[model samples]
Target: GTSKLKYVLQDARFFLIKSNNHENVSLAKAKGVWSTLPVNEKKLNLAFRSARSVILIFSVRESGKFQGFARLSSESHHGGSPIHWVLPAGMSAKMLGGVFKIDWICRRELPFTKSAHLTNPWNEHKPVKIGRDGQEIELECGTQLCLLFPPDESIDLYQVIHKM
Candidate 1:
């Protein structure tokens, strides 16, 4: 199903898509990825738009507090708008699958007011949230865009285990 809906995070060039039902956390960090995507811009845009409801931007840390953003789907009675929070530094996030580990390279703060664990280097804002303490987020099951960033700017890079 295709729609004319514009890309939800139009300004974001880096996209990290995750499926709650799946195990892979895929990253689209290459500038050429968008240009060379097998699907047309419209289809890709729709893909991103459709997942907006089921997805959320998360800030996972290893030694500090957890903080980030989240988008509530229509089914969500919590509220219509997004949610966000900030926590102490040195926060840490343990990847669900222990086989993978993210070695955060930079603790540099973004231009906005935030802690080390809540990394937003570009100062971009939208779709922020807080999980229920090491608890699973109750978002819908579908493809989700968990993290977003602009081209030439990225917090870190992970191993690509899957292809688009």
Candidate 2:
């Protein structure tokens, strides 16, 4: 039994409802260039929708050793945008010459995908990079090896939008 048919509504009724619909699909935006990760850059600043799908790939690129994972979700909305990184504390160790590669990936699975995937979360596939010698990578969100801090703080990253 149908309560109301689609074709039955007048154009004015559709117009009124359109203005009322306000679905908030949270997305991330870069705030600024990342600097030398502080000794306490541990607290992740998560931005984006509450239940969006996001996975972090922490790697030691040289030897390709997977360090660990930065899990994100409604509760752990801990890191996003600028650098999708290790939370509560970034490390100063070695998997590959202390050159860790953290990547933001799509865990857009169902049941799997919690509620709805945020329009676009951070990922390496589409990125922006800025660093030494005018070397730059156009990114949806940029991530460089948090190479040097304090002494050589530089503004290298420039945020942009990317699509698959």
Candidate 3:
């Protein structure tokens, strides 16, 4: 029953509405749809607080749809601990246009991680890989926040080892 409640990516839309004002800004540029929170404050704090750096991992699907993956070493300003990653958005037509998978990896981790794929600009459905030792993740434009943890770790402790 819980799995049935999961949100479907195909029908999802990720928009960047201005915080507080709630005005639609430029759409997020990454795989996956918009994040559940208007702004990921907790993540922001992590990058600013504990880990000096962070990394964002993303993936696209065969349909050129972006999906949310995991965040690493993210912190909140309000004394909140850091998380490895946060699901910023789900893949949607607005970001990834064609029927292909694309991966976006950040140079450095931050509180907020975003991804997108666009066709209007004629961007190719090129899938890129992030992380070391061939541990890359992938997703389509419309995907749920399904996280795959490293073999020997749980979601709660992933961040701890993620910092290494």
Candidate 4:
């Protein structure tokens, strides 16, 4: 069977930033710190290849309930850097409570678009105390939670690849 692969621009990646403890440290610091965390490049690349867009859901278990999310696009084609969006602690909590969902949409030139869903996306499940340097909150999401990708759309796989 022949399968056509859909391609998207490079600038369509988004991120959700949230933390269990925000009062101790500024939201900017949290976003910067978490952004640098070691992520699997291969997995991320695979994810991009498989989908048109990427979405990350973040959850925090502190006075702030749910953290907001961000979105990215794949139609721009901005090199290899992934697009990112950050939600402040206050806004994140306001939009999403203790348990929330963040949806990321990726638009391509194809006949349909794709999306990703993150459920209970956070570092720690329980609330922890904050320290002077700010609480080093370690969010732990339960494995029971699941992520949902958009339903596969029907397309002419052969034509798509043949054009390439």
The count of backbone overlaps in candidate 4 is 13
Compared with the true structure, what per-residue lDDT tens digits does model 1 show for residues 6-106?
13222323222222211121221111111111222233344344543222333333323222222222221222222111213442222111111122212
Query: Residue 32 in model 3: shift from native, Å?
Result: 15
For candidate 3, give the lDDT.
0.25
lDDT of 4: 0.28
Expressed as tens digits, the lDDT of each residue in 50-136 for candidate 4 is 544443334344433223222222212223333233445444322322111122221111110112122222323222221211122
Global lDDT scores for all candidate models: 0.24, 0.19, 0.25, 0.28
Stretches off by above 4 angstroms in model 2 are: 1-44, 48-51, 65-70, 73-164
lDDT of 2: 0.19
TM-score for each model: 0.20, 0.20, 0.20, 0.27
Error of 3 at 59 (Å): 3.7
Best candidate according to TM-score:
4
- Rate residue 6 of model 4 by lDDT: 23
Off by over 4 Å in 1: 1-100, 103-128, 138-158, 162-164
Candidate 3: C-alpha RMSD to true structure equals 16.7
lDDT of 3 by residue, 3-95 (tens): 211222222222111211111111223332222231333333333344322333333322222222333322322222222132235623222
Minimal lDDT window, size 10, model 1: 28-37
What's the CA error at residue 91 for candidate 3, in Å?
Answer: 14
